[PDB]
């Protein structure tokens, strides 16, 4: 069956297809995207009934009657029970029943306009309201009931019941082949990816890891470093300060009673019954209840019972505070409460409702006031001249100090100070206080103050904290200069995989910081030459995105553009500043994409022999629609790498009026005005660009890439041995390069080296992609946020008012957007410009790298350059750079000095290089290095001397040296 | 509510009975009686001009 | 100038009589009354005038 | 009411706490978003300065 | 900065209403982050050394 | 400030400084990418270039 056990913990098995699970709602359900949410997806027991007989059962929320449990179990308070049905009979015949705390619940459907309709029986002392509630949806897959009554069916909330105890579900199943199962679950906080309106895959906002996941809305975390701060204690300990005052005391006393009506004969939810309300001592011949006293307190008394799905309360109604809130040290300069309406004052509706679903002002409570002081509202009881001070030293507390409230951690310092009795930042946060009656400073801390945690191939492999012991679970703690490091650090590692200012972190997490021809000697030399393959990637431009001011400010309605038209030149501003932008990146990116058709016909494997190129020149146009296509490597690249769900940029408008389905990412931001523009380099021109541009190196062509060794090897390097165990080393590291691209493969540290830069670039490129999804998305969701008016739905607004007062509402929803289009002039411009250096620098790396081959060191890979390959990557160029390196590395010996017919002495002024001879040849070389490459005229000058410590010559054999001595 | 071209559409989906952007757009609705899924396309969605 | 042709409308929607070269954005016009669409859940119609 | 969150909490019912809220996180974010204007300039002015 | 702890200086309910913010936090944070990691990465390129 | 140091921040036995009063409000400045000591290491070669 496709069930599966429950994993240790409660957790749902990630390999899992969710496949008739929905994620909840009260409304709108998504059609794609990542959302965070609490879903009753955390599994306290699951298990199955299978229709070649039937049981019938009641599951109580608290476990008890539940099924065989697979894979795990416990035994909590669960918030929900979903039944997942895989059969077609639905609920069309038999019934579902709640117990509920006051009596029994039915629910059930009938056709007896040919369709189903469902009712609820609230069954009470045995007489039943029978109710009508809804249609039913035609193909029920899913439902679900919480504890607290909601019922769910395929994901939508339809109705709710009020508080239940335990659900019986019952059927009569027309086949062995039917089942459902039943699971129990508590919600949990979770990111998930839904498609097509369905959940593809989840995370758990748990451990340390997954918590960053979801507070990015991604599933894939970039290598970097990120705030955090750790989750806060649950519940807190009151401290409170004030200054010694005379404690008179009140209590503001609040009565309420009512009663439900009774029989049917007056129908029970109707409206209270009984209805009496009072507050202590309001005689109302003195006028309102006024505070008189320094302190007081409210009380709320519910002299009514909870009976059957009868509610009340105070709410705030139109006040700046709500009754049993004052409780909080709340100050007024008087305050005053009555039962009978009082003028200036805000009123507090004593509110009775019946089902959460018809709601009566039984009363309403009427309170005035001044602000200032002198008058505090307080949790219990004082007395006399004497005031107490209440402090929780160093624990994370919940304080109210001389009227500043807050959380954090007090403690006693060492600090003296005559001024004030408070200390604040310029934030305006407390930092400290003073006991006024004993002279003791005290200090605030922030309990979880920010953390930092890095990050390195989505696991936390190290933090930086504020002090000296190992949160997160790492095993060990140093000092550095200005913070404390924490990790599961050996600390021996020399190579940085993140750099942080001066400090390097390594793969481990541990973290480190970072920065001869004139003597006879012994020196060490690669006696052999081995060759790296080493990746670097630069982004080229971004997507240019133009946006419909008018359309994402108004959604479209008429009266709202004539109103935006008040905002003089502010859509203007806005439109034209990415509209210039745009053509730049255009202007440029369209210059730096060349073309030169005799390179492109060349640039092809039959020029190369040995080098197996064929992974990186583009494809053949089988399609005839074009002059190239991409490469092997690009479509792993472009494959490997995954597309947003945030917000896409491959847009495609032809289909978004046809309207045959429901919008995709790229239509549901086109209606918000937001264009994508047709991305500046084609999959073609870069094709063509990036062919003529390996094509350049054909302008023999494996015999001019060994002419490319020479520069490093003159004589050895062309003996068959190089010619043919070279490429052979090439074709080797370019198939490890195209496998860590094609898939996981473990580098070990001598692969490391150009396995890390490949793992680096495909961190880089999806970080590209995350931050254009995460800047358009911002945009977006904007939309979604009211500004302090009624609604975000601007036709709501018009809907509900008239013109002259709904054209202020929407003054606020047209200022909101309009700053939120500001804010993404900014992201883009600012990632126009990063980019615009990133494209400069790609231009010449292509030049003295690409075309040129580079004398420079570490400028294209560690280590001796020979020739680049360029491919196309998202919004990017990615760079492949050949590279040689020391191997069978052992003493070649060097000589300061030649004797010349074995009378006159060679002394060398070279002391850049190492200089040593083999095979009737001397070479000159960097001091640690095997370049067989000859030395130079005024390298050397001469002596009427010898030195035994010389080799020995004639003015012949100089001509080993050079012809010109 | 809002103004926009009600279409009856190709897709079938279990869940829900609206559907939206990320913006909160409607962009269709479930006939809950019948089980057909309508698309909202906002009538004049910006053009292009040269 | 009057704010009718397609042109004066990208003009006068950008306050300037002369409009230089590119590509600008536009939503067309509207149909000036619109039908009225409803959609909601089965519910009892019980029923009120507030007069 | 005030900008310390804490009191707003203290003194409301969470409904309408939120929408206070709401005002204190839109304007901080936008303090934010100009603090990060001025960082970006900056190091784009130093950029220039560096080269 | 840490766009959480600046918009609700650690008090829990406000964070759990930030979330709504869908991604402000993320785009702020992640621009300083960005340009503090291209600073240190060039200024760390220019400061060679030779013993 | 920007001259930060991180590491009595939560020890307190002394009221915040600017310091640490801005890395309450969540504000961290990061350690100073040139360093006196790589600073003086860069100069010092460079003066003696000549
Ligand atoms: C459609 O709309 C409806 C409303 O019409 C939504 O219903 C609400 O949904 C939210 C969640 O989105 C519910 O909140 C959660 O409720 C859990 C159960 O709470 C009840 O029992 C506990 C005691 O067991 C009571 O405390 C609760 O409230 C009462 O007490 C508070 C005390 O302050 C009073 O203020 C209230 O007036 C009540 O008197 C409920 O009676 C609850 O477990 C859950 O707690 C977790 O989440 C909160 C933050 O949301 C954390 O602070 C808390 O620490 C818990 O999370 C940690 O703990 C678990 C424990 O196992 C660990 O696994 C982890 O460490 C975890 O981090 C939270 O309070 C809300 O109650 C509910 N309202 C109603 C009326 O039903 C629907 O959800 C919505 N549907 C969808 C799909 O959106
Ligand atoms: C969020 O969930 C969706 C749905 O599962 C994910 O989209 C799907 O991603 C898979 C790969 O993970 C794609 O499969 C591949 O498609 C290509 C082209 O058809 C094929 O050649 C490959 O062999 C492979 O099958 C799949 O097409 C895609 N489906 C849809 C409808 O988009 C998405 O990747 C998930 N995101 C995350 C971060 O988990
Ligand atoms: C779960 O709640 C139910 C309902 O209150 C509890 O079951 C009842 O427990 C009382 C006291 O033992 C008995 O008088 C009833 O006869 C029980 N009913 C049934 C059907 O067992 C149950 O004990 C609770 N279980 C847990 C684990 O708390
Ligand atoms: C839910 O309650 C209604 C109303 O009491 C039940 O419908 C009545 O059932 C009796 C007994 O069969 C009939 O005499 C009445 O004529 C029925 N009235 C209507 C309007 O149909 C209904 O049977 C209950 N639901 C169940 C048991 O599923
Ligand atoms: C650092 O090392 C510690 C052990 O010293 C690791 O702690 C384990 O963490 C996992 C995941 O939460 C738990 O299942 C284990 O039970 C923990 N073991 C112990 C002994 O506490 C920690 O995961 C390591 N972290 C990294 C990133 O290497
Ligand atoms: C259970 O459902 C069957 C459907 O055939 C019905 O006949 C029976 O009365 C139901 N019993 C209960 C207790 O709901
Ligand atoms: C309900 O639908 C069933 C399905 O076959 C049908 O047989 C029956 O006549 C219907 N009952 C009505 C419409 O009252
Ligand atoms: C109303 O309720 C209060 C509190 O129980 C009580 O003092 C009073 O006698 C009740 N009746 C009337 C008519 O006020
Ligand atoms: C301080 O407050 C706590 C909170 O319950 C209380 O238990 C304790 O008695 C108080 N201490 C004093 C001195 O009032
Ligand atoms: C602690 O307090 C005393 C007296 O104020 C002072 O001499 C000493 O220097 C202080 N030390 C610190 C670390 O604050
Ligand atoms: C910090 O923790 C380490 C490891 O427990 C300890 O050796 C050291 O003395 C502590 N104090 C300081 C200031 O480093
Ligand atoms: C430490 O690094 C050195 C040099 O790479 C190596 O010889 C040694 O095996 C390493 N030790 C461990 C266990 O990491
Ligand atoms: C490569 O060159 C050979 C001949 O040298 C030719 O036959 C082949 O078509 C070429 N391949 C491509 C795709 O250019
Ligand atoms: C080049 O390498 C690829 C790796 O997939 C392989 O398919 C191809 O046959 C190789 N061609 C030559 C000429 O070695
Ligand atoms: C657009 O609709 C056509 C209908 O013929 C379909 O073939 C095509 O795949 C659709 N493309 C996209 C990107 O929706
Ligand atoms: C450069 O390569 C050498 C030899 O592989 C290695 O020892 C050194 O650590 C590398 N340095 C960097 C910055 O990669
Ligand atoms: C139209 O709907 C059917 C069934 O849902 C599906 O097979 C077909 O691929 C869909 N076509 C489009 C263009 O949506
Ligand atoms: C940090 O506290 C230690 C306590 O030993 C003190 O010596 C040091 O001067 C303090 N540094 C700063 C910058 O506060």
Same mark, same amino acid.
């Given at each position: ?15 899992? !297809? ?23 997806? #955390? ?93 039913? =949806? ?46 129990? !679950? ?30 990015? #809305?991604?599933? *894939? ?82 002299? *009514?019972?909870?009976?059957? %799905? ?26 005053? @409460? ?10 507090? =509706? ?48 919940? *304080? ?16 003296? @100070? ?65 913070? @404390? ?27 480190? !910081? ?68 745009? %053509? ?116 023999? @062509? ?56 490949? !793992?680096?670039? #495909? ?92 004398? %420079? ?109």
């Amino acid at each position: 069956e496709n069930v599966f056990a429950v994993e240790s913990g409660g957790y749902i098995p990630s390999d899992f !297809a969710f496949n008739n699970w929905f994620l909840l709602t009260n409304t709108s359900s998504v059609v794609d995207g990542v959302v965070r949410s609490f879903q009753p997806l #955390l599994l306290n027991c699951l298990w199955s009934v299978s229709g070649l007989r039937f049981t019938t059962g009641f599951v109580y929320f608290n476990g008890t009657g539940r099924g065989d449990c697979k894979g795990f179990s416990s035994d909590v308070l669960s918030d929900v029970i979903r039944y997942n049905l895989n059969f077609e009979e639905n609920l069309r015949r038999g019934t579902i029943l709640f117990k509920t705390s006051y009596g029994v619940v039915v629910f059930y459907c009938t056709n007896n306009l040919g369709n189903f309709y469902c009712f609820v029986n609230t069954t009470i002392g045995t007489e039943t309201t029978s109710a009508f509630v809804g249609a039913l =949806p035609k193909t029920v897959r899913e439902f679900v009931i919480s504890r607290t009554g909601h019922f769910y069916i395929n994901g939508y909330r339809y109705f709710t019941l009020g508080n239940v105890e335990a659900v019986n579900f019952n059927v009569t199943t027309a086949e062995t082949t039917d089942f459902f199962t039943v699971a129990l !679950a508590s919600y949990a906080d979770v990111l998930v990816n839904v498609s097509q309106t369905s959940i593809a895959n989840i995370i758990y906002c748990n451990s340390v890891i997954n918590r960053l996941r979801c507070d990015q #809305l991604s599933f *894939y975390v970039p290598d970097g470093f990120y705030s955090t701060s750790p989750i806060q204690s649950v519940e807190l300990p009151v401290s409170i300060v004030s200054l010694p005052v005379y404690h008179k005391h009140m209590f503001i006393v609040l009565y309420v009673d009512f009663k439900p009506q009774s029989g049917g004969g007056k129908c029970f939810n109707c409206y209270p019954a009984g209805v009496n309300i009072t507050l202590a001592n309001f005689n109302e011949t003195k006028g309102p209840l006024c505070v008189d006293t320094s302190h007081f307190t409210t009380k709320y008394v519910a002299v *009514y019972a909870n009976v059957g %799905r009868w509610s009340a309360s105070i709410n705030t109604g139109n006040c700046p505070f709500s009754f049993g809130k004052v409780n909080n040290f709340v100050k007024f300069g008087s305050v005053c @409460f009555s039962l009978k309406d009082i003028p200036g004052g805000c009123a507090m =509706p004593i509110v009775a409702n019946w089902a959460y679903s018809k709601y009566y002002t039984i009363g309403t409570l009427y309170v005035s006031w001044s602000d200032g002081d002198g008058i505090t509202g307080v949790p219990q009881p004082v007395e006399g001249v004497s005031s107490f001070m209440n402090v929780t030293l160093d624990k994370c507390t919940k *304080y109210n100090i001389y009227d500043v409230s807050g959380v954090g951690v007090i403690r006693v310092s060492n600090d003296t @100070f005559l001024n004030g009795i408070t200390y604040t930042s310029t934030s305006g946060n407390l930092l400290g206080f003073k006991d006024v009656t004993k002279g003791t400073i005290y200090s605030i801390t922030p309990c979880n103050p920010p953390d930092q945690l890095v990050v390195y191939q989505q696991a936390v492999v190290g933090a930086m904290l504020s002090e000296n012991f190992t949160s997160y679970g790492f095993s060990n703690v140093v000092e550095l200069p200005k913070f @404390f490091y924490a990790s599961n650090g050996t600390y021996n590692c020399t190579d940085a995989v993140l750099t942080y200012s001066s400090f390097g972190v390594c793969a481990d997490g541990s973290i480190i !910081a970072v920065q001869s021809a004139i003597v006879t000697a012994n020196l060490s030399i690669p006696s052999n030459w081995t060759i790296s393959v080493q990746v670097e990637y630069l982004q080229i431009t971004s997507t240019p995105i133009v946006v419909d001011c008018s359309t994402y400010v108004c959604n479209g309605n008429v009266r709202c553009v004539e109103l935006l038209k008040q905002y003089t030149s502010a859509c203007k501003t806005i439109e034209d500043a990415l509209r210039n932008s745009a %053509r730049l990146e255009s202007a440029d990116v369209s210059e730096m994409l060349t073309f030169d058709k005799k390179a492109f016909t060349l640039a092809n494997v039959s020029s190369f022999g040995d080098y197996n190129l064929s992974s990186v020149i583009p494809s053949l146009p089988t399609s005839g629609s074009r002059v190239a296509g991409r490469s092997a490597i690009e479509d792993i690249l472009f494959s490997k790498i995954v597309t947003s769900g945030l917000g896409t940029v491959d847009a495609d408008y032809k289909n978004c009026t046809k309207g045959l389905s429901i919008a995709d990412l790229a239509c549901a931001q086109y209606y918000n005005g937001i264009m994508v523009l047709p991305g500046v380099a084609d999959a073609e021109r870069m094709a063509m660009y990036t062919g003529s541009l390996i094509g350049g190196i054909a302008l023999p @062509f494996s015999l001019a890439i060994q002419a490319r060794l020479n520069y490093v090897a003159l004589q050895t390097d062309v003996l068959q041995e190089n010619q043919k165990i070279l490429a052979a080393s090439f074709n080797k590291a370019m198939t490890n390069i195209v496998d860590a691209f094609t898939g996981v493969n473990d580098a070990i540290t001598q692969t490391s080296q150009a396995l890390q830069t490949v !793992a680096t670039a #495909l961190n880089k490129i999806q970080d590209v992609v995350n931050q254009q999804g995460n800047s358009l998305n911002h945009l977006t969701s904007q939309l979604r946020q009211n500004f302090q008016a009624i609604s975000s739905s601007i036709q709501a607004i018009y809907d509900r008012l008239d013109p002259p007062q709904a054209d202020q509402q929407v003054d606020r929803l047209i200022t909101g957007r309009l700053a939120a289009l500001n804010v993404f002039v900014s992201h883009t411009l600012t990632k126009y410009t990063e980019v615009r250096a990133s494209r400069q620098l790609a231009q010449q790396k292509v030049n003295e790298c690409v075309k040129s081959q580079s004398k %420079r060191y570490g400028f294209c890979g560690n280590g001796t350059h020979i020739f680049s390959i360029v491919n196309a990557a998202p919004e990017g160029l990615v760079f492949l750079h050949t590279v040689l390196l020391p191997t069978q590395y052992k003493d070649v010996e060097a000589w300061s000095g030649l004797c010349v017919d074995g009378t006159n002495g060679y002394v060398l002024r070279q002391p850049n290089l190492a200089l040593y001879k083999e095979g009737n040849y001397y070479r000159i070389t960097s001091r640690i290095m095997f370049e067989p490459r000859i030395p130079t005229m005024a390298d050397f000058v001469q002596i009427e001397n010898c030195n035994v410590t010389f080799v020995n010559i004639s003015r012949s054999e100089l001509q080993t040296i050079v012809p010109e001595y």
